[PDB]
Amino acid sequence: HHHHHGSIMKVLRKGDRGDEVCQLQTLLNLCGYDVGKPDGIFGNNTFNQVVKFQKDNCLDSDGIVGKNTWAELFSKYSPPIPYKTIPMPTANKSRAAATPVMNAVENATGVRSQLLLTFASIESAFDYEIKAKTSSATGWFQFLTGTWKTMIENYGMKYGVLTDPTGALRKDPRISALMGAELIKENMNILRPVLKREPTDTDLYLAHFFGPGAARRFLTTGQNELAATHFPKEAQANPSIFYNKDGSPKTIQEVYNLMDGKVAAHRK
Ligand code: NI
Q: In terms of domains, do 76 and 16 share one?
């Protein structure tokens, strides 16, 4: 039930802090129990609302947030933007069918649909069911089971999805696009601080490809420098792009230009 999911949630107490306390406060506000802007720190405002919420619902009202209190929240909260408000595309593997969807997602998350379109194209050529033969990567944005799970717990409620144990919703274009835009948001947010420029699609693809941390260093690590040197895990993971046909390491600029070209093939 919702009890099993609340069962694996972290048991929270006044004094804790982190993504969990953040998910908690969101749910409390989304339940009608105002705690304020979620900050990730379980203080007094949060404690008093938890207690009341527990009393209003006949739960052990001691301020401790366990299985039962979590399940109740997952049960009462009202999703600000249910993913069903995003329309399904009329067809699969179609860029034109995906357009209206990405427009709705842009209105919902703020991320430009041209960008969402480019990514869904490079990742799955618009097949929202495609499942990589070399990994978990599934759907339009080819989400791995790990990253998907993380994305659900941290943004899911916002769209009416608390858990996807199977990771099966990665095949649904609506939720994948929403989650995809949230991922892009985190990344463009990490990159812009260190960049006298608005992150480009290529910049964001690098973050999508090598991780936000990896890309951050890369996007600012000497043009004519040997990439494989600074990015060993990345270089060993994609030798085809980090090394020339003869085995020698390419320069940073060469890796970038190579990537920017892969992206270019999927724009407009
Ligand atoms: Ni409990």
A: yes
Query: Residues 6 or more apart from 184 whose CB is under 8 A from it?
Result: 111, 115, 116, 119, 204, 208
The residue among 86, 114, 148 that closes a domain is: 86
139 in the same domain as 69 = no
Told to judge if 182 belongs to the known catalytic residues of this protein, a careful annotator would answer no
> How much distance in Å is there from the Cα of 69 to the middle of ligand 1?
5
* Given 20, 72, 106, 123, the catalytic residue: 123
Residues 55, 152, single domain; the answer is no
Is residue 163 within 8 Å of 189, Cβ to Cβ?
no
Residues 194 and 149 reside in one and the same domain: yes
CATH number at residue 138: 1.10.530.10
- The number of C-alpha atoms within 13 Å of 39 and in the hemisphere containing its C-beta is 11
CB atoms closer than 10 angstroms to residue 152? 22
Range of the structural domain that residue 63 is part of? 1-86
Task: List CB-based neighbours of ion ligand 1 within 5 Å.
Answer: 66, 68-69
- 256 C-alpha to center of ligand 1: Å? 51
Q: Which experimental approach was used here?
A: X-ray
Any long-range contacts for 155-159 (C-beta under 8 Å, 24+ apart)? 155/179, 155/182, 157/23, 157/26, 157/27, 157/30, 157/74, 157/77, 157/79, 158/26, 158/79, 158/80, 158/81, 159/79, 159/81, 159/82, 159/83
